[PDB]
């Protein structure tokens, strides 16, 4: 989990014991790395940073991507049961209990008032043959509308409307873990803004090239 | 008024022909399987993706990167995921396919791994070999082999 299984973890120098009379350059840091006088620390690739750090192998798994179960010990690595011959129901149910039945195919499709009405209310009322109390229905609807805040804000920040960095900070404020992985949110705002302006002037000069390329064959 | 009889006759003819259509689909799939298992033993298909040769082992992270790089399009599956293998083309032209058995696929990447696998894969292969005929083979085989040495 400390490398998620990718293995290409980022590395960083945290502290540097600089000699009295030098400047914090890059070559001095490298020379300290040679003699290990700087604190080399491991950052996960799960953390995504503005500056891509050197991504090398994870020492906790030696590049494989897994940790062996150290709780299991060599003296008790074997059992005595002849459970392996008669294939049980419980082993199959257990190995299938960690398959999660991934629900993402409905959660994303669920963002519709009529479709949410159907899935949340109408299907249980038809299949089960019961009827909900008004408190139950209203609490379902309230929790649903409360859950739809993040997707509404994502849709609003996806417009690239002026002043979208405020809604970007709102997204990073409402829920940390999900906003740490959303591709819409940009880590460095001046990066994207000046790259957008540069791309605008770049397509301007591309138009210049593609329009003066047609004035020489005549 | 007799055109409805024409409609019924055409409907029955369509029933017959589409019966034959799905039946020929099944004909081709079972005949393909029979030809596959007939060509497997003779060794005429040696070296292709239907009879690969062993190579070096691989780790979880290399399988993950080859999953990001869209190389994985054939597998070999058995034993609830504790033993798996993959098959890769290589360029020797001569395009040959090799099998690599993956090492200790740990616990819980599969629902993410099958997230990509199911979109790249064209055909999975699942082996069904039980335990009891294997064990009967072990006991009878060690008996006969050691009596042969004796």
């Amino acid at each position: 989990t400390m490398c998620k299984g990718t293995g290409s973890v980022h590395y960083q120098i945290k502290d540097y014991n600089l000699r009295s009379g030098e400047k914090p350059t890059a070559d001095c840091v490298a020379d300290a790395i040679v003699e290990n006088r700087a604190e080399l620390v491991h950052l996960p690739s799960s953390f995504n940073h503005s500056a891509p750090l050197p991504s090398k192998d994870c020492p906790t798994c030696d590049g494989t991507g897994a940790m062996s179960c150290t709780e299991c010990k060599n003296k008790l690595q074997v059992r005595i049961s002849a459970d392996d011959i008669m294939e049980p129901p419980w082993k199959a149910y257990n190995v299938l209990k960690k398959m999660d039945y991934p629900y993402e195919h409905i959660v994303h499709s669920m963002k519709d008032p009529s479709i949410a009405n159907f899935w949340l209310i109408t299907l249980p009322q038809i299949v089960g043959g019961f009827d909900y109390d008004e408190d139950v229905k209203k609490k379902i609807w309230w929790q649903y509308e409360e859950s739809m805040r993040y997707d509404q804000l994502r849709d609003l920040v996806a417009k690239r409307n002026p002043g979208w960095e405020y809604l970007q900070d709102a997204l990073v404020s409402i829920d940390p873990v999900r906003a740490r992985e959303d591709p819409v949110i940009v880590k460095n705002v001046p990066y994207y803004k000046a790259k957008k302006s540069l791309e605008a002037e770049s397509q301007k000069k591309a138009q210049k090239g593609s329009r003066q390329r047609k004035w020489w064959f005549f | 008024k007799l055109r409805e009889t024409e409609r019924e006759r055409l409907s029955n003819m369509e029933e017959l022909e589409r019966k034959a259509n799905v039946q020929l689909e099944r004909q081709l799939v079972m005949a393909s399987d029979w030809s596959r298992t007939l060509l497997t033993m003779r060794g005429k298909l040696k070296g292709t993706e239907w009879d690969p040769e062993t190579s070096h082992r691989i780790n979880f992270s290399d399988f993950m990167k080859l999953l990001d790089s869209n190389s994985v399009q054939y597998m070999e599956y058995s034993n609830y995921g504790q033993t798996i293998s993959v098959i890769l083309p290589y360029y020797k032209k001569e395009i040959i396919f090799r099998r690599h058995i993956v090492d200790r696929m740990p616990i819980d990447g599969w629902n993410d791994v099958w997230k990509k696998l199911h979109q790249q894969i064209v055909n999975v292969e699942v082996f069904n070999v039980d335990v009891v005929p294997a064990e009967v083979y072990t006991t009878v085989a060690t008996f006969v082999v050691w009596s042969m040495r004796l």
Partner: peptide, 17 residues
Amino acid sequence: LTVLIKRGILILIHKKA
């Protein structure tokens, strides 16, 4: 198929032979 590496390690393997 279930081969035993010493120090008591059980490894499940492919079909047979």
